[PDB]
Ligand SMILES: Nc1ccn([C@@H]2O[C@H](COS(=O)(=O)NC(=O)[C@@H](N)CO)[C@@H](O)[C@H]2O)c(=O)n1
Ligand SMILES: Nc1ccn([C@@H]2O[C@H](COS(=O)(=O)NC(=O)[C@@H](N)CO)[C@@H](O)[C@H]2O)c(=O)n1
């Protein structure tokens with residue numbers, strides 16, 4: 001959610017900044033609804049005042065015939081409920097527009113239409129030169145009997161996986177290594193979160209109202225008929241960021257740095273023919289998430305720090321990667337500034353996204369009413385929120401398998417992971 | 429699913445054994461539907477034969493006027509489709525009855541009506557005597573700021589938890605210790621499984637058709653309209669056991685021993701006023717599951733072995749417990765024989781279920797068509813399946829917190845978990 005006063009005082013400058021993202025703000029429709037809202041607001045508040053007044057005149061005469069007055073208060077109450085219902089419907093239309101507006105991109109963000117306009121910032125490591133034909137992670141998984149896509153189709157359907165034996169153990173070692181790195185070295189606190197969330201949570205982080213189709217939704221429970229319209233989380237960012245919803249945080253307690261390892265559920269709509277083979281684009285994937293709740297003046301420095309925390313995972317694992325600054329046209333809905341990390345994938349002969357690190361500014365904080373204050377201060381202000389993958393675990397397994405494969409299909413275990421695998425040097 | 433030939437040749441002896449579970453088999457309704465099914469089966473197969481014959485008479489005359497014959501084959505095809513549809517509806521009614529029949533209890537199982545008729549087999553450890561008033565895990569969680577139920581209500585709703593900091597780290601250490609114990613010492617292979625499963629999987633392990641209300645169900649995806657009616661898994665037993673669905677296993681490859689650590693999703697219907705406070709009965713909980721696929725003659729020995737594997741977790745953790753043999757009236761739907769482990773819970777002054785270990789016999793194997801064969805053999809036979817908690821992780825955290833609490837609220841870390849907590853001796 002954008003600042004409502006910024007839409008009222010600078011609509012053309014807001015519309016111009018959003019135009020860089022390829023978003024067309026309908027200023028005229030929004031202005032026409034808002035002018036009508038003011039007329040109905042005055043009409044309704046006048047009806048509210050007169051009903052409150054005639055209700056007080058009844059209480060006076062009751063202790064001092066209240067029949068001609070009771071009929072008047074009943075008629076006024078009928079008219080008021082009707083006026084309030086009409087105003088509430090108009091407010092819902094204004095909200096449908098306002099809550100579908102993406103975040104204003106920061107001036108640091110390069111202007112572009114899509115992913116082809118993204119800017120490479122840095123590059124780390126040298127992609128390995130192989131003395132044999134490169135096998136992809138799918139072929140390697142079949143050789144070990146450790147990645148079974150057909151069993152997952154039998155259990156569930158397409159875009160799911162079953163991992164078995166040492167490759168499932170390795171997937172676990174990766175998530176353990178990531179959590180330990182962020183909690184022991186990077187100052188993040190560990191969290192266990194619900195994997196099902198409510199509508200308030202989804203509005204809070206921006207999945208609602210615009211991206212319901214990106215999610216798996218659960219049918220309400222019989223004994224919780226009106227309070228169990230849940231969705232499976234697409235990322236730990238959703239429950240972690242909402243932990244500060246409706247809170248006033250003492251500024252001395254900031255930054256609040258949180259991490260979680262969770263499965264992530266995504267419908268992956270519009271991905272027809274894209275990443276059809278392998279672990280890259282599943283409906284269910286594990287991810288170690290980093291979330292930071294910071295003071296408004298520290299968010300740009302926090303983004304650099306969090307991106308470096310995700311880079312550290314790739315460096316310790318010895319996985320070559322490139323760091324990309326996303327352009328205006330390739331950023332996610334909530335982001336004002338994003339860096340993507342793209343890992344070398346030998347079988348694809350390219351770099352593939354493994355992390356996305358964003359500064360959300362006060363966009364989610366506004367929706368959630370997540371505030372901070374110094375003890376002295378006469379007013380609070382909205383916090384800034386940040387989120388970054390550290391990392392998507394299935395995609396890390398793909399990069400590890402392909403980059404560390406031996407001529408006979410054996411997988412060398414990266415040195416940093418050997419303590420997490422009882423010192424094991426190779427799988428196979 | 430029971431053996432259809434056992435229902436045909438010994439219905440009264442089957443009905444008698446099921447009566448011990450408090451299940452009343454409607455022999456008369458089942459016999460009346462089956463006598464009608466035979467009449468329709470003969471009628472339909474006669475129509476099938478005559479249509480196949482007149483279709484062959486067309487192909488003869490076509491290569492040798494096919495108009496009076498085409499009209500006959502069309503009319504026969506109309507009558508056949510109608511007869512097949514009528515027979516298929518009757519088959520669906522017979523299946524609704526057959527698939528709602530629970531497993532025949534083994535002769536080892538004591539007869540009883542409910543949990544009060546269960547038999548204590550053994551007891552291990554001495555419940556600690558405290559020099560202070562015992563705090564429950566909820567009070568201890570609030571003292572550490574590590575178990576937050578109000579944040580989970582805000583994110584989702586009731587019967588969910590948010591764990592923060594060292595208590596979330598400890599919950600993770602428990603699951604890691606369990607997986608390592610079963611994979612390194614107990615001969616289980618590790619698996620990563622889907623947490624969403626299809627209708628075939630749910631029928632396979634017995635959740636369908638009778639217990640759809642025990643589950644969270646997802647609405648189908650727009651791009652997978654007819655193939656995505658999924659449910660969240662209530663236990664890793666559901667995807668793991670279904671890995672052998674429609675398979676013929678070489679008997680030399682048995683036993684197949686599988687383990688997985690997953691969240692578990694349960695509607696917890698009918699639990700009004702029961703375990704309202706704390707982690708004991710959540711909609712989402714982590715569990716380390718053990719599943720064994722064995723030869724029919726080894727299932728009773730496998731049950732003893734698997735129960736001992738779950739007991740070992742409690743013993744190494746120094747948690748006092750009792751082992752209970754469940755009576756006929758307290759067993760789950762698929763089980764023919766069950767042992768429950770019940771851990772000492774100091775604040776409740778009783779033992780609480782932490783594991784349930786079952787021999788399912790060939791009940792799920794029949795539904796799944798999970799078979800085995802020796803290379804020589806002219807026929808296959810159904811395998812036996814077993815499942816046991818090793819253990820429910822949230823309930824282990826409850827037992828650990830309450831049993832290891834210090835006078836000031838600090839939690840002593842059990843010696844076996846200290847290597848999983850970087851040698852940390854106490855939380856707080
Ligand atoms: N089906 C899929 C979809 C995505 N991913 C991987 O999740 C990462 C974060 O996703 S995000 O959508 O780019 N941002 C987020 O979710 C933020 N909370 C930061 O993590 C991607 O960078 C990609 O590497 C995957 O592994 N499988
Ligand atoms: N809401 C809940 C419900 C149950 N449990 C814990 O799951 C264990 C296994 O569940 S079972 O239903 O008894 N059998 C099974 O699921 C088998 N697959 C073997 O694991 C119980 O013994 C209890 O300790 C919990 O922690 N929270």
Ligand SMILES: [Ca+2]
Nearest residue numbers: 251252253254
């Ligand atoms: Ca501080």
Ligand SMILES: [Ca+2]
Nearest residue numbers: 330332340356
């Ligand atoms: Ca992106």
Ligand SMILES: [Ca+2]
Nearest residue numbers: 332334335358
């Ligand atoms: Ca974002």
Ligand SMILES: [Ca+2]
Nearest residue numbers: 679680681682
């Ligand atoms: Ca063997």
Ligand SMILES: [Ca+2]
Nearest residue numbers: 758760768784
């Ligand atoms: Ca039970």
Ligand SMILES: [Ca+2]
Nearest residue numbers: 760762763786
């Ligand atoms: Ca069972």
Ligand SMILES: [Cl-]
Nearest residue numbers: 003004005008
């Ligand atoms: Cl406003």
Ligand SMILES: [Cl-]
Nearest residue numbers: 431432433436
């Ligand atoms: Cl049959």
